[model samples]
Structures are given as C-alpha cells and as structure tokens.
Target: GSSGSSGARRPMNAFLLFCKRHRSLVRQEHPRLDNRGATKILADWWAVLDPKEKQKYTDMAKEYKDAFMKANPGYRSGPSSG
Candidate 1:
C-alpha cells in the first residue's frame, strides 16, 4: 500500500528557516492578548483533560503549537520548573 513516492524532507537550513518563518507567521495570526506560547497553553489545556484524553491533546501538540506560534512567535518551549 505504498505510493512509492517519498516525501521531500527539508535540510537543516530549510528546517530552521521554516521554524522561524512559521513561528513569526503564527504570532501575527494569533489573538492572545497575554502572549502565552502555544506549548504553554496546550499544556494548560491538557492538564484539565481526562487522563485518557491527555494523549490525544499531546498528539495534536504540533498543530496546537503552530496555531499559537503564529501569535506568540517569541515564546520559548521549556519546563516551567526547570
């Protein structure tokens, strides 16, 4: 069931550029006045979900981050306590 076509992967430079561009682009489109990062918001949201639902939210983290990245590109990913 393979398409026999491989997806084009980005180089390191391309990956960084893409992350930078996506990060900035996400910021402009997001409307969060507090400017919290996507990851932070998703983490908070995930905390309230049922334990079983946590994985689903975690799985969608990329999309969540992408959405917030547009609005809070300056936000950095990290553990709050660390």
Candidate 2:
C-alpha cells in the first residue's frame, strides 16, 4: 500500500493519518509546498498517537495524505532531487 519499503520501522502511512487529524497544522506548516514539510510535521505529531492505535492510524494517515497531495498539487516540494 505505501510507497516505502514493507515493514519499514516508520510506516509512511501513519503520517497520512497524522495529516488528516492535524489538517490545520499541516496546511499552516506547508501551505504552499507539496507535502514535504507537511510530511515532517505529520511524523512529529504521529508520535503522540496512542501506541495501540499507531498502526491503524498510520495506515489511515497514508491513505489520506495521498488524497490530500493529489488534490492540492501546490503542496509539493521544491526543485531538489534529493
């Protein structure tokens, strides 16, 4: 499901959930970027999610993050290959 490696310690999907929950924060942090900064902020906030719910939330987050990015193409990263 996620673009990242399977079983990656920090599941990328979790950030999707984090973004959905903290839409305002994500938008405020990276209103013009294509989810680059928003991704970072989502990771930081994901840490606060309940441990038991982390996996579930992470999966959900990934789904929403993808949708959000697709909808707001403006929220993208700069011209940096790295």
Candidate 3:
C-alpha cells in the first residue's frame, strides 16, 4: 500500500505545469539563457499572460489535483511525511 513516506508523483500546480510545458521551448528559442535565466523568462511570460489564458492552466491543475486526491486518499503533504 502507498504510504506517507513513499515517493509518489504529486500533481503540479498551474505555474509548474506551465513551466514544464514551456521550459524546453524557451530554452531552445533562447540558447543564451541558462536554466535560471530560462526560468526567469518563463516567469515573466506568465506574469504578462492574460487571465483567460492562465485560467486554462489553472483548470488543468485543478483536474490533476482532483485525480491525485482520488488516487491517494491517505496522502498528506508536509516535511514530516518523508
């Protein structure tokens, strides 16, 4: 059975999922950007994005979280879990 200390794949929030989707593209487009720089660029882009566009990612994250909760009913997030 899955337990608190087990290593599980947790659901990512909106920004994290967005970053996952775009990080590679941003890195490829801006070859000069290091990982941190790429992250900054992504953050800036996220900041300037329209609310409606952001909402799409937000909705995806909510769906992921709901699925996670359904699958891992006993899971709790905290340092002590590890």
Candidate 4:
C-alpha cells in the first residue's frame, strides 16, 4: 500500500539478524511454508536459543546500527512535520 510514504527505517536488530541467517534454511526445509510461517518458526527457535549465540547477534546489531546512524544522521525518529 506504500502507506508509510515517509517511513524511516531502523537497522536490523538481533532477531532480524537471526532471521536473515536462517530464513533460507527454514524455507528450504519447508518449501510449502510461506515467509510468514518461516518467520514464526525462527522466532520459536530464537526464544530458546543459546544466550551466547544471541549475545553475538546483539553485538552484530549494534555495529549495524552504528553504521546506519552514521549514514542517516538526519533520518532519526519519524517524519513528524511531513
């Protein structure tokens, strides 16, 4: 619908980092599942995921966020007066 015409974006957080990595695997394993279903499966696994592993993704998320911030210094928050 393109409803968010001025929608700003946020860097991928830990959960998204996890999803990007495993999305393909999940899709491959269950070819019948749509992206919506695969996402749920990943979330289920994410909840019970090892703390150390999650920590790694958290760190990765921080790095990505830092880069995104630098590149979009004026894009923070939403378009309030747009």
Better of 1 and 4 by TM-score: 4
Worst 10 residues of 4 by lDDT: 73-82
- Kindly list the per-residue Cα lDDT of model 3 for residues 1-82, writing each as its tens digit: 5555665577877887778788887898886999899999889878777878778988788777766776655666666412
Residue 19, candidate 2: alpha-carbon lDDT: 71
Candidate 3's C-alpha runs over 4 A off are 1-9, 70-82
Models 1 onward score TM values of 0.24, 0.38, 0.63, 0.72
- Could you give candidate 4's per-residue lDDT for residues 1-73 as a string of tens digits? 3765764677898888988898888888877898889988889878878978888998788678866776554
Q: RMSD in angstroms, candidate 3?
A: 7.7
Candidate number with greatest lDDT = 4
Candidate 4 deviant stretches above 4 angstroms? 1-6, 71-82
Question: Judged by TM-score relative to the true structure, which candidate is superior, 1 or 2?
Answer: 2
Model 3: how far residue 53 lies from native, Å: 0.8
Residues 22-72, candidate 2, lDDT per residue (tens digit)?
877777767885666766777677766787677777557555455555444
Candidates ranked, most accurate by TM-score first: 4, 3, 2, 1
Clashing pairs in 2: 13-58, 14-58, 16-61, 16-62, 17-61, 33-75, 33-76, 34-75, 34-76, 35-75
**Steric overlap count per candidate:** 6, 10, 0, 0
* Model 1 lDDT per residue over 3-38, tens place: 795634423222333334444454555536234674
Candidate of highest TM-score: 4
TM-score of 3: 0.63
